[PDB]
């Protein structure tokens, strides 16, 4: 399986972290940094943030069916809007690809890890 079992591993670990996103400083900051760096969000796509109890699309509060602000296009001269990701999951990618990163983080992280291995050895 090689790559495929790797995708399974990564998706499983980041879904687990998302489900406990607000209990883990380590994972919280890890996910925040990864998303802000690779301009990505989640596993297969940003929809994964729906499995967090606060961001589920049938949740009561306003964090429902939205995505944490680290998935917005942070590389702008603008200041941080915490609510930039709200109410974006029920809508299909191209509506919000101007507002948030839509690709998942698994694939982007793995393609970077591959193409930047020439320096990793020696």
């Amino acid at each position, epitope marked *: 399986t090689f790559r495929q079992q790797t995708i399974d591993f990564l998706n499983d670990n980041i879904r687990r972290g998302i489900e406990n996103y607000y209990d883990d400083l380590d994972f919280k900051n890890i996910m925040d940094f990864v998303q802000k760096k690779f301009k990505c969000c989640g596993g*297969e796509d940003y*929809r994964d943030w*729906s499995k967090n109890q606060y961001h589920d*699309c*049938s949740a009561p509060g306003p964090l429902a*069916c939205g995505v944490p602000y680290t998935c917005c296009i942070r590389d702008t001269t603008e200041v941080v809007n915490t609510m930039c990701g709200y*109410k974006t999951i*029920d*809508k*299909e*990618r*191209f*509506s919000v690809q101007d507002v948030i990163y839509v690709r998942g983080c698994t694939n982007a992280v793995i393609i970077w890890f591959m193409d930047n291995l020439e320096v990793l050895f020696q």
Partner: antibody
């Protein structure tokens, strides 16, 4: 060639159940949502709920959560809406729709007419 | 919890004239809003998406704009084939809701 074909019109006795099927074509099925909308014969459009095939997640309007259940079969590239405990009011036309790459509902099904009648 | 209200319950005006329909929201929905047209004896077609933009294939005489709470769809140089019933929906927060439906009649 983005098209949605629904089931043929259905007739059911009161209290029975119906399975409406919606086959999609022209686009990657798993990537886009499917919405369902019901129009009673003499009224406007009324919103059932949404379902995303790639994850299987579902959201319902509160009114229809009891009476309807939404499913998908990715291999068929088809969505289904199952209605149960049908009332004399539930006789209506049901549409399955796929929205445009931007927010609007671009592609509407022709409509499946379900008549609850003895 | 987000209910739509359409202003002209039934509105008839003459050809060539400019008419306007209003769609008021219960809560701020920013720009997430859509307009559809339903010719009688026909399935609905998409008319306007995202408040301002027009869906492909719509004649340019249709225009729409507004802000969060209140929106307007305006038809200039009205034509007979535009006899239909017109609807608006919101999409910001699920569950999506529709409008009351506004009937359009020509005066001839």
């Amino acid at each position: 060639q983005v098209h949605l074909q629904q089931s043929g019109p259905e007739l059911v006795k009161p209290g029975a159940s119906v399975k409406i099927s919606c086959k999609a074509s022209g686009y990657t099925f798993s990537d886009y949502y499917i919405n369902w909308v019901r129009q009673r014969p003499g009224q406007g459009l009324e919103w059932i709920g949404w379902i995303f095939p790639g994850s299987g997640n579902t959201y319902y309007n509160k009114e229809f959560k009891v009476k309807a259940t939404l499913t998908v079969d990715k291999s068929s590239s088809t969505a289904h809406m199952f209605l149960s405990s049908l009332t004399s009011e539930d006789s209506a036309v049901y549409f399955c729709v796929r929205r445009y790459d931007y927010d609007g509902f671009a592609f509407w099904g022709l409509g499946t007419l379900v008549t609850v009648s003895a | 919890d987000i209910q739509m209200q359409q202003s002209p319950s039934s509105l008839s005006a003459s050809l060539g004239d400019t008419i306007t329909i209003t769609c008021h929201a219960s809560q701020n929905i920013n720009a997430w809003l859509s307009w559809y047209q339903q010719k009688p004896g026909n399935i609905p077609k998409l008319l306007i998406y995202k408040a301002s933009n027009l869906y492909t294939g719509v004649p340019s005489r249709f225009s729409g704009s507004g802000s969060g709470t209140r929106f307007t769809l305006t038809i200039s140089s009205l034509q007979p084939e535009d006899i239909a019933t017109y609807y608006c929906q919101q999409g910001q927060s699920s569950p999506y809701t529709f409008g009351g439906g506004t009937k359009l009649e020509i005066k001839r």
